[PDB]
Amino acid sequence: LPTIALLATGGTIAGSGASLGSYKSGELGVKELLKAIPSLNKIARIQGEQVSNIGSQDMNEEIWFKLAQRAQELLDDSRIQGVVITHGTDTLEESAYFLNLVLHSTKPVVLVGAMRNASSLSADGALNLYEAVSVAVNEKSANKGVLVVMDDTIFSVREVVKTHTTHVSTFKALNSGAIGSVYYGKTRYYMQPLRKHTTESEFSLSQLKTPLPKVDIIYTHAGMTPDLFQASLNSHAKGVVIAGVGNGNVSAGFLKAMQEASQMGVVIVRSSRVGSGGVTSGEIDDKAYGFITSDNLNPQKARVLLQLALTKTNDKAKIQEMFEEY
Amino acid sequence: LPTIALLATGGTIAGSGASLGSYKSGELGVKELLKAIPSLNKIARIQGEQVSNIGSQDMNEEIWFKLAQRAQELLDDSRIQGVVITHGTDTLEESAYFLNLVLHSTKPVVLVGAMRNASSLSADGALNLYEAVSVAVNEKSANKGVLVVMDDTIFSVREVVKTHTTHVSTFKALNSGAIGSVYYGKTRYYMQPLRKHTTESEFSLSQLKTPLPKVDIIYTHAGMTPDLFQASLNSHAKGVVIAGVGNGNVSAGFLKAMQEASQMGVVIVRSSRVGSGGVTSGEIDDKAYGFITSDNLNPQKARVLLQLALTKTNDKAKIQEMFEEY
Amino acid sequence: LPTIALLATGGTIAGSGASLGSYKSGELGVKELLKAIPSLNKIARIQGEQVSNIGSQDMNEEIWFKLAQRAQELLDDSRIQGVVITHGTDTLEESAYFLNLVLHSTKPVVLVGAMRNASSLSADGALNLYEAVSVAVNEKSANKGVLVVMDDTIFSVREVVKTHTTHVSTFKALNSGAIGSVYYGKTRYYMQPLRKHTTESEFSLSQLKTPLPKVDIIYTHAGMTPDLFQASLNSHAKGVVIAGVGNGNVSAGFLKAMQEASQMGVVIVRSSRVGSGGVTSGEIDDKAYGFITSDNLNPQKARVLLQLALTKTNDKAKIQEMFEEY
Amino acid sequence: LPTIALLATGGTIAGSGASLGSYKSGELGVKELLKAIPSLNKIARIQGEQVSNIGSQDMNEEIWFKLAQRAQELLDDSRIQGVVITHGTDTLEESAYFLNLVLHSTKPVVLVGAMRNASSLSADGALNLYEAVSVAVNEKSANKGVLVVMDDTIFSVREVVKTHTTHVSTFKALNSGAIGSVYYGKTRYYMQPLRKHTTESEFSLSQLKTPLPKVDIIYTHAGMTPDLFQASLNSHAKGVVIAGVGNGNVSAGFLKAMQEASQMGVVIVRSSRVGSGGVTSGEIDDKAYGFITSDNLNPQKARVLLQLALTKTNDKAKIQEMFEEY
Ligand SMILES: N[C@@H](CC(=O)O)C(=O)O
Ligand SMILES: N[C@@H](CC(=O)O)C(=O)O
Ligand SMILES: N[C@@H](CC(=O)O)C(=O)O
Ligand SMILES: N[C@@H](CC(=O)O)C(=O)O
């Protein structure tokens, strides 16, 4: 059978206590996760290890770099056929995108979590993990970038987002859709992601060091004032992503603050709070002010790309090109 | 015919220049809006006026109070059968919710905008406005709270959100659905909203003064630090809404900052960045720290309710009760 | 504790064998369903019984009438506080609507199923059933018509449809939305259904006899010919629902066949194959031909209402009025 | 500028009269369509012609073959850079899929329609057509199979379906998502379709003759009986697609009828009425009876593939392989 490395980071998939909720994220080790499925041993040899044991609300760059380094080392090993990472669902979409930009392998990397804790009635993690391992061993899963497998569905990491606080079907791809299906391990792909990933990426771990450039996200709303934006500047942000209203829009006072920050060399990205769709110029002439539009990346994924962009360049045109290509 | 007051605030529905985009939000007056439909004059006498002429990204409390005061005065007039407000789509959902909580009338109040500027190819505002006026005159539109009519659909103000940066069908109700349909003016309702609105609300304009209590919204993501949260505190926020990860979750450092702020009397509301679903206790014991869960309100609508809550009380239990009732 | 009657009909919620699929619909009895939850005994006394043990693809009028008669008798009993019906998901939406039109009680009736068989990894039935019982005991569940509880969500029977072949979140309300949420038994309602149900319905079991009037559903597509439509007529259909293309449209040859059938007294309802939205007149002048538009009912629910309509009247205007009211 | 052939077939995009509905599908010629945009002449030379002038509810094989033959001849011409087809929305998804399987070119073919008639308030056709022409000239639109452009979105023909009776945003890809976006002509692709299309297809016009093999679609519901199925057999159907309940399920009497028909050489495809998801074996052992599962194709697109399959083979395994590959 193929060997799959399983890298556990924590998350509700490993959470425990209760059957009706009542749990901590974060709790059981990477070997109890395997005891509840082992029809698993029919499809892969699993090499499990613990990278961290946290709720993903506590995900940070130290763990991202440990996770990415371990994943890359295993992907480089000819005895490893693919990697599955168990992860809390809250920030899974950010870790997936980060790995999609920094890992260099054609072998499948699949992130998976659970929206119900492992001891819940009707817990969802066992079948999600079976499926995830099924996708990671499938030959057609190679060369598609980092994948997320949840609730019988296969997503590309750039596209997938957590859209609901609690539903088991919370992950969706609101702009471009799921790239495949997996039903009790039967895997089918219907789409190939076109944005640059993994082996095609200019970012790589050997070139990166934590702390990454500081990038904050600023929310907007009626009655908004740029006081938190200015505080971000004062705390030495190198980039700021705005979760703007509608098509990345902001108040006049915000815009003047953004213009001044950009003129000082801070990179300003216009994203949106709305949850889907691309941000475009038009009401704001981005090129007039040096602003970057975040494509159809939501604020947290725009931040991931911006942080990596800023390790390479401060050139606005080049950064806008990265948002067109990644 | 019935008389409908039309209160114009600006927005892309009044934006102009271009046929392929290229426009300012904000631009044409409340009487050109009526020239392009007037089968309108077959269903209502329209009494139009300009309250403001801005893109809704510049919506603020001065305009909210002017708008609400004018709407209430017209609703109190026996010669007015309903009110239509034209508004930019970016913050329409916030203005609608604010009016839903402060206006006291059973007569229909309908907000409407356009996702394409008035001089676009296939501009959407003319039919949206025809429809909006159609809903506002319909007898079944009374006593349902403030309404939003967009793209052939009737929404309750608490439920409706802008979900996409640019699509004409951007407004959706992701938790509870649209309450009715309107197709070339033919109006049908299928649901009655149950949360408290308008005549049942404890908030009213005569009790409110701007500036409302300061409430900021703090975004969260992997690698988050509470530095912007602390800056909000330092700028004298009376309440803070957190756009938390997943089910309103935050990092350990965030949680400790939130706990300290709550113990000092700042009201902390856990909302979510994800876009849909209710925030619940569980991983966070809200009652242990005095935190409020934002129900299924997204961060910007949670902020609207919190600002009004704070004019009445600092009592956490009472504020959580408002989030259960409004 | 309240007493809830549990009426089992079969379905994948009672299906068994396998952990990876491989099961029959239909298989385990109404008392094993209760062994896997019994935190249940903390919220209700359950009086279970088997009405049938079938996959819902074999649901028919004999079982509908047995089910409805038993439900009505239990609802009439002062010792019964509500009723939960376990049911296969395939035709759950039809049974729910039928019961919504024929049962006369204000007490809650809740239908529930499972998309994974009971012995699957991550089977969904235990928590769906816990939730269903939670909703059925809740005082706010009364007087809302028949309910469907699935996947943490509360639906009104008229609105809910199975939209996906296999996902656990397959049930949705595509026109009007879910009316509430239930999360580990915590029940909240946000909407009241407005169409006529249960105690407000003119249909009642004591007036109905099986076989109900024969009503067929005819599908449409490019290259369509009315040969199957004519066969329905030849097999003595009293009504025919057309699953038309787009806004209930049909080919010229279909239309002429429909016109002739209507002139002979067969009642023709224009529904749609598309899955959502109301069917309207316009391209077809329904009143010219005596046709009925099916509102926003999909073909199978339009058929349920039409069958009941035809026990009362052949009057087209009265039947169109039923499609406006139910 | 590039030359784009525009092939008009009719549809609401060419419908006229009325500003509030009231129109015939079908009505204005392929040259008035061009008068209302001509910023068009800035992006392409348009060579327009009328193939037909019908509502798409009257689409049939005579027009499909005329349309396909003309499209292929133009695609074979070195002076033609791409083809846009204007079409009624009702059966657009079927024509698109048929062309995706029979046309052999790498140049873009784009189908487009309008959900509001051309003389409606806020008619959607002008911008949809501008966009469609924009996509058809874009170099990245080549080699992706037949495309559908509607409402600012780019779809692959296999994936796209009309989901709502009347909304302008009715077309969606419920399983795999849109492959790109187009906003006032700015075209971006995020996904490549993987199922076989156009140049990779084994079907081609030179091998096909109308009438194609007869294939009917049979709807299912509670209380179903195979009488219409038997009538299809009696009318010499070569294949039958079942719009089954849930995961392609049917009553016991249906199943026995299906088994007998298959044993006689009629090819039986299990699709679903639900609107999304793949049909799988499991409750029905398809290989036991010779049945074909329709993948995630809805009944009308399953019919298109089945008709073409039947011109090539009667071999069940080979036909199931086509449903795995196309
Ligand atoms: N807070 C949890 C939520 C989950 O995994 O569902 C986490 O992200 O670790
Ligand atoms: N920025 C504009 C967007 C719109 O109306 O569509 C506004 O909200 O005023
Ligand atoms: N065929 C099964 C499907 C299910 O329950 O999920 C039934 O409806 O009984
Ligand atoms: N019945 C029309 C509907 C439309 O185009 O929107 C057609 O398909 O031709």
Short mmCIF file of C-alpha atoms in Angstrom, two decimals, chain D residues 102-316:
data_model
loop_
_atom_site.label_atom_id
_atom_site.label_comp_id
_atom_site.label_asym_id
_atom_site.label_seq_id
_atom_site.Cartn_x
_atom_site.Cartn_y
_atom_site.Cartn_z
CA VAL D 102 -20.00 17.30 -31.27
CA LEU D 103 -17.98 20.39 -32.26
CA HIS D 104 -14.31 19.89 -33.08
CA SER D 105 -12.36 23.10 -32.66
CA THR D 106 -10.12 24.70 -30.11
CA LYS D 107 -11.54 28.16 -30.83
CA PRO D 108 -14.07 29.54 -28.34
CA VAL D 109 -17.78 28.86 -28.73
CA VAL D 110 -19.90 30.88 -26.30
CA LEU D 111 -23.64 30.60 -25.72
CA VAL D 112 -25.47 33.57 -24.18
CA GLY D 113 -29.09 34.54 -23.45
CA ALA D 114 -31.17 36.99 -21.43
CA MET D 115 -33.64 36.38 -18.60
CA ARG D 116 -35.50 39.68 -19.29
CA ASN D 117 -36.84 40.56 -22.72
CA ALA D 118 -34.92 43.14 -24.70
CA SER D 119 -37.56 45.82 -24.11
CA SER D 120 -37.83 45.20 -20.34
CA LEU D 121 -36.82 47.73 -17.76
CA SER D 122 -33.26 46.78 -16.77
CA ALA D 123 -32.96 44.22 -19.57
CA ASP D 124 -29.92 42.00 -19.07
CA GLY D 125 -29.13 40.96 -22.65
CA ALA D 126 -27.02 43.89 -23.80
CA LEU D 127 -24.34 43.46 -21.16
CA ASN D 128 -24.53 39.66 -21.34
CA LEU D 129 -23.84 39.88 -25.10
CA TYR D 130 -21.01 42.39 -24.65
CA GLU D 131 -19.47 40.05 -22.20
CA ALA D 132 -20.00 36.98 -24.29
CA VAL D 133 -18.20 38.62 -27.21
CA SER D 134 -15.43 39.70 -24.83
CA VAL D 135 -14.95 36.10 -23.67
CA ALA D 136 -15.07 34.72 -27.21
CA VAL D 137 -12.17 36.96 -28.33
CA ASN D 138 -9.99 36.23 -25.29
CA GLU D 139 -7.01 34.01 -26.00
CA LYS D 140 -7.46 32.10 -22.70
CA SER D 141 -10.99 31.05 -23.74
CA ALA D 142 -9.55 28.61 -26.32
CA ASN D 143 -9.30 24.88 -25.61
CA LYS D 144 -11.75 24.92 -22.70
CA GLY D 145 -14.74 23.32 -24.47
CA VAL D 146 -18.00 25.12 -25.19
CA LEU D 147 -18.70 28.01 -22.82
CA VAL D 148 -21.73 29.74 -21.44
CA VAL D 149 -21.46 33.37 -20.40
CA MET D 150 -24.25 34.82 -18.29
CA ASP D 151 -24.56 37.51 -15.63
CA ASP D 152 -20.79 38.33 -15.44
CA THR D 153 -19.83 34.64 -15.09
CA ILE D 154 -18.10 32.11 -17.32
CA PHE D 155 -19.25 28.49 -17.19
CA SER D 156 -18.22 25.24 -18.83
CA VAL D 157 -21.04 23.73 -20.79
CA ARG D 158 -21.11 20.39 -18.99
CA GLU D 159 -21.48 22.04 -15.59
CA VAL D 160 -23.97 24.87 -16.13
CA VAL D 161 -27.71 24.60 -15.41
CA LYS D 162 -30.69 26.93 -15.27
CA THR D 163 -31.69 26.76 -11.59
CA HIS D 164 -34.40 29.40 -11.22
CA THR D 165 -37.47 30.20 -13.28
CA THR D 166 -36.87 33.94 -13.63
CA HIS D 167 -33.79 35.33 -11.87
CA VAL D 168 -31.10 36.95 -14.03
CA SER D 169 -28.51 34.87 -12.06
CA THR D 170 -30.39 31.63 -12.74
CA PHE D 171 -27.39 29.85 -14.35
CA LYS D 172 -25.16 28.11 -11.86
CA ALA D 173 -22.72 25.24 -11.65
CA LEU D 174 -23.90 23.43 -8.54
CA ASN D 175 -21.31 20.64 -8.46
CA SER D 176 -18.11 22.21 -9.74
CA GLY D 177 -18.50 25.98 -10.02
CA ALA D 178 -17.98 28.67 -12.66
CA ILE D 179 -14.62 28.46 -14.45
CA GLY D 180 -14.11 32.25 -14.73
CA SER D 181 -15.48 35.74 -14.37
CA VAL D 182 -16.15 38.50 -16.87
CA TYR D 183 -16.78 42.03 -15.62
CA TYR D 184 -17.48 44.67 -18.26
CA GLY D 185 -15.44 42.52 -20.63
CA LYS D 186 -12.47 41.85 -18.32
CA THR D 187 -12.06 38.05 -18.48
CA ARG D 188 -10.38 35.82 -15.91
CA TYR D 189 -10.22 32.02 -15.68
CA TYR D 190 -9.61 30.11 -12.48
CA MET D 191 -10.36 26.51 -13.54
CA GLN D 192 -9.83 24.18 -16.51
CA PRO D 193 -12.66 21.63 -17.16
CA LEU D 194 -11.33 18.07 -17.10
CA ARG D 195 -14.11 16.01 -18.72
CA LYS D 196 -13.70 15.37 -22.46
CA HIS D 197 -14.89 18.05 -24.81
CA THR D 198 -14.82 19.20 -28.44
CA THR D 199 -11.43 18.18 -29.97
CA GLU D 200 -11.12 15.27 -27.49
CA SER D 201 -14.59 13.91 -28.17
CA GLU D 202 -15.33 10.69 -30.03
CA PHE D 203 -18.59 12.14 -31.24
CA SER D 204 -18.56 14.31 -34.33
CA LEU D 205 -21.12 15.78 -36.67
CA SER D 206 -19.95 13.87 -39.71
CA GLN D 207 -20.95 10.63 -37.96
CA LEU D 208 -24.33 11.74 -36.73
CA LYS D 209 -27.76 11.93 -38.44
CA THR D 210 -31.10 13.12 -37.13
CA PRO D 211 -33.23 11.53 -35.84
CA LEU D 212 -30.90 10.60 -33.02
CA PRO D 213 -31.81 7.52 -31.02
CA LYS D 214 -35.00 8.14 -29.05
CA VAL D 215 -34.40 8.79 -25.38
CA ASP D 216 -37.18 9.77 -22.94
CA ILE D 217 -36.96 11.14 -19.40
CA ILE D 218 -39.28 9.71 -16.72
CA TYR D 219 -40.02 11.63 -13.53
CA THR D 220 -40.48 9.97 -10.15
CA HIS D 221 -42.27 10.83 -6.89
CA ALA D 222 -44.14 9.16 -4.03
CA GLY D 223 -46.92 6.91 -5.34
CA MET D 224 -45.03 6.50 -8.64
CA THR D 225 -46.02 3.67 -11.04
CA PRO D 226 -44.10 2.63 -14.12
CA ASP D 227 -47.00 3.28 -16.51
CA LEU D 228 -45.29 6.23 -18.28
CA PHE D 229 -42.03 4.29 -18.29
CA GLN D 230 -43.82 1.43 -20.08
CA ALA D 231 -45.34 3.88 -22.53
CA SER D 232 -41.86 5.14 -23.38
CA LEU D 233 -40.87 1.54 -24.11
CA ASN D 234 -43.96 1.09 -26.22
CA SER D 235 -43.06 4.18 -28.24
CA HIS D 236 -39.71 2.55 -29.13
CA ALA D 237 -37.35 4.41 -26.84
CA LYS D 238 -33.77 3.21 -27.28
CA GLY D 239 -32.74 4.68 -23.92
CA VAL D 240 -34.58 6.00 -20.88
CA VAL D 241 -33.23 8.41 -18.31
CA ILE D 242 -34.91 8.20 -14.93
CA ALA D 243 -35.10 11.41 -12.88
CA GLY D 244 -35.02 9.30 -9.71
CA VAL D 245 -35.65 10.30 -6.16
CA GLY D 246 -32.58 11.21 -4.12
CA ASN D 247 -29.62 9.11 -5.31
CA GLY D 248 -31.46 7.93 -8.45
CA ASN D 249 -33.90 5.73 -6.53
CA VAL D 250 -37.17 4.26 -7.73
CA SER D 251 -40.04 2.12 -6.45
CA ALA D 252 -39.89 -1.67 -6.48
CA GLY D 253 -42.35 -1.79 -9.41
CA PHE D 254 -40.23 0.74 -11.29
CA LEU D 255 -37.11 -1.27 -10.64
CA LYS D 256 -38.67 -4.45 -11.97
CA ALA D 257 -39.82 -2.60 -15.12
CA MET D 258 -36.35 -1.11 -15.57
CA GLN D 259 -34.75 -4.51 -15.14
CA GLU D 260 -36.98 -6.02 -17.80
CA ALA D 261 -36.38 -3.16 -20.22
CA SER D 262 -32.61 -3.41 -19.78
CA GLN D 263 -32.73 -7.18 -20.36
CA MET D 264 -34.48 -6.42 -23.65
CA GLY D 265 -31.72 -4.09 -24.81
CA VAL D 266 -33.13 -0.69 -23.81
CA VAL D 267 -30.39 1.35 -22.10
CA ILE D 268 -31.52 2.62 -18.70
CA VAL D 269 -29.73 5.55 -17.08
CA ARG D 270 -30.31 6.46 -13.43
CA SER D 271 -30.21 10.22 -13.01
CA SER D 272 -31.85 12.29 -10.29
CA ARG D 273 -34.58 14.92 -9.95
CA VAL D 274 -32.80 16.65 -7.09
CA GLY D 275 -30.67 19.07 -9.11
CA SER D 276 -27.09 18.33 -7.91
CA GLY D 277 -24.68 15.53 -6.89
CA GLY D 278 -23.58 12.34 -8.52
CA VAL D 279 -25.70 9.25 -8.75
CA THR D 280 -23.96 6.21 -7.37
CA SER D 281 -24.62 2.50 -6.99
CA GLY D 282 -25.28 1.16 -3.54
CA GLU D 283 -29.00 0.86 -2.81
CA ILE D 284 -29.21 -0.31 -6.48
CA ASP D 285 -26.62 -2.71 -7.84
CA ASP D 286 -26.45 -1.20 -11.29
CA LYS D 287 -24.09 -3.77 -12.69
CA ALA D 288 -26.51 -6.52 -11.65
CA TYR D 289 -29.14 -5.08 -14.05
CA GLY D 290 -27.12 -3.39 -16.74
CA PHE D 291 -28.12 0.11 -15.58
CA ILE D 292 -25.95 3.16 -16.14
CA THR D 293 -25.41 5.81 -13.44
CA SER D 294 -25.55 9.35 -14.83
CA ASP D 295 -22.55 10.76 -12.92
CA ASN D 296 -23.48 14.31 -11.79
CA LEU D 297 -25.38 15.03 -15.04
CA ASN D 298 -28.98 16.13 -14.51
CA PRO D 299 -31.62 14.23 -16.51
CA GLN D 300 -31.66 16.48 -19.60
CA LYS D 301 -27.88 16.50 -19.97
CA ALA D 302 -27.73 12.74 -19.28
CA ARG D 303 -30.20 12.37 -22.16
CA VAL D 304 -27.93 14.36 -24.49
CA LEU D 305 -24.96 12.13 -23.75
CA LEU D 306 -27.07 8.98 -23.97
CA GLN D 307 -28.48 9.86 -27.34
CA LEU D 308 -24.97 10.31 -28.72
CA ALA D 309 -23.69 7.19 -26.92
CA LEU D 310 -26.40 5.15 -28.60
CA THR D 311 -25.23 6.17 -32.09
CA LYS D 312 -21.94 4.40 -31.25
CA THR D 313 -22.76 1.40 -29.05
CA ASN D 314 -25.25 -0.58 -27.05
CA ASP D 315 -22.54 -1.84 -24.74
CA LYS D 316 -23.39 -0.94 -21.18
#
